[PDB]
């Protein structure tokens, strides 16, 4: 069982973890420390409109006529850094940069959104989500209470995050999982699926071994984690449905400027 192959898979896992730590300053460990009240360096809780206004000093403004579209434009602009970090991470995946460059772009242009949601789950618990770079905490029920269609923006991400966070993955697990997401041979428009699957097969072996070594308590964790890719994709494609809801909405879609800024840090 501990043979040259398994050692190579552990080396791959370590390589990915190291690149992950280098590429992603916001780790799950850091997020969970905040969420479980361990960093004494502590987020202000925004749980209603009153606390929202009282948090005005802590929401820094960074920056369409539709508020929702402006939010999406802002968050997608703010996501560039994440996209660049994920792309940088992908370069560390053995074989990735040797793929047809079109396929690299295709893999990343689908994968980055799923990875952003995966990492967003690290910032979430059942109560809410860290915002303002770990400096604020926006409650899930406050977000859910906002007038349509805003109240529906984040709840499916929370529903996912609760189910995903129940897997108790750590950054070592996530480093490989994210690589498996990127090396998805099923993306539309892929030119050469087989070299992608060759890499993903290696990453999957590495992930399977990682999860066996790291989660003795979890039956079928590998399968359960792979099934979460279904939920991730669903969340991404739900954004298309949200856009249609927004264009059809004729009710008031005003939103407090601080909520707009908060949503722009979300995805």
């Amino acid at each position: 069982q501990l043979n040259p192959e398994s050692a190579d898979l552990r080396a791959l896992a370590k390589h990915l973890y190291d690149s992950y730590i280098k590429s992603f300053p916001l780790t799950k460990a850091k997020a969970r420390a905040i969420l479980t009240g361990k960093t004494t360096d502590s987020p202000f809780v925004i749980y209603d409109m009153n606390s929202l206004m009282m948090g005005e000093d802590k929401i820094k403004f960074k920056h369409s006529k539709e508020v929702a579209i402006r939010i999406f434009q802002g968050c997608q602009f703010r996501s560039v850094e994440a996209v660049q970090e994920i792309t940088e991470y992908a370069k560390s995946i053995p074989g990735f940069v040797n793929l047809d460059l079109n396929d690299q772009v295709t893999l990343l242009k689908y994968g980055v959104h799923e990875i952003i949601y995966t990492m967003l789950a690290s910032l979430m618990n059942k109560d809410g989500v860290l915002i303002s770079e770990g400096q604020g905490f926006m409650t899930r029920e406050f977000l859910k209470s906002l007038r349509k269609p805003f109240g529906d923006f984040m709840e499916p991400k929370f529903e996912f995050a609760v189910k995903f966070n129940a897997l108790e993955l750590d950054d070592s697990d996530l480093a490989i999982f994210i690589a498996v997401i990127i090396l998805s041979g099923d993306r539309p428009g892929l030119l050469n699926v087989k070299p992608i699957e060759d890499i993903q097969d290696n990453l999957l072996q590495a992930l399977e071994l990682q999860l066996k070594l790291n989660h003795p308590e979890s039956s079928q964790l590998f399968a359960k984690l792979l099934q979460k890719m279904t939920d991730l994709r669903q969340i991404v494609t739900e954004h298309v449905q949200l856009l249609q809801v927004i264009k059809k909405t004729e009710t008031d879609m005003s939103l407090h400027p601080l909520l707009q800024e908060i949503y722009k840090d979300l995805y």
Partner: peptide
């Protein structure tokens, strides 16, 4: 915009 951002980041 995204494909260009990724293409650039891959450089």
């Amino acid at each position: 915009g995204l494909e260009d951002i990724i293409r650039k980041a891959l450089m």
